[PDB]
Ligand binder design. Sequence first.
Ligand SMILES: NS(=O)(=O)c1ccccc1
Ligand SMILES: O=C(O)CCCC(=O)O
Ligand SMILES: [Zn+2]
Length: 257
Amino acid sequence: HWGYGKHNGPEHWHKDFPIAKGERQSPVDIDTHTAKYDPSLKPLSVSYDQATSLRILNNGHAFNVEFDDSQDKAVLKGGPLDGTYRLIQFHFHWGSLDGQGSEHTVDKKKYAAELHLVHWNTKYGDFGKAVQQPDGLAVLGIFLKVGSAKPGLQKVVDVLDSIKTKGKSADFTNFDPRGLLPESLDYWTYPGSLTTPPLLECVTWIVLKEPISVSSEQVLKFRKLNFNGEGEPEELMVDNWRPAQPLKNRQIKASFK
Ligand SMILES: NS(=O)(=O)c1ccccc1
Ligand SMILES: O=C(O)CCCC(=O)O
Ligand SMILES: [Zn+2]
């Protein structure tokens, strides 16, 4: 099965998922000088006041904080989007060292990690149908740099010991994802894909310009997770990021001057 090793990592994925070599793959490098300011782009509307987290899961590739998406409770609107997208889960990608870990890059800069808040377009009824559509998902990407701690991240950090290995989950209620957002909602946007198999070309990417700061201790706890299941040879969950893919025929737009 696919993963992030020499034998099964990103350079192998195309054999089982030929769309890996497609026309709208993610992530990409964001060349800040060639991204065009688009005055037609709207402010992003992030409405997470009623978000209901349920559970946290080690799926063997990352950990997902899952939400109740059975009603319009946590939604993303505006920005480049038409209509309403409902939050289903968030997860991160991160490195073995602070100098790598993000999927998107900015003028070739790699951040220590990247948060993905995943939302599906309500016009398709649920997530599985949405991923079959070119406007099915909106993923809000937020870079992490190492410095001061992010207080709103600590509840996530502290539960990771209980989901060390693949397949473990834990109740994770009342977590407020507003605590993971930076001050500014300035963003870049482009059409792309899931960054893990099945690599479907269904995502409007919205990447925030302003990173959040997390502490070295917080990211070190991410790096204690395991890709393996319980009682299997320990493989630390690090470097679970796909490198930048060819931009091909796409334009990255900026919401800000
Ligand atoms: N990593 S990502 O593109 O946010 C993603 C989101 C949902 C499913 C698969 C991948
Ligand atoms: O299935 C594969 O081995 C990848 C190539 C398939 C294709 O490019 O259509
Ligand atoms: Zn992701």
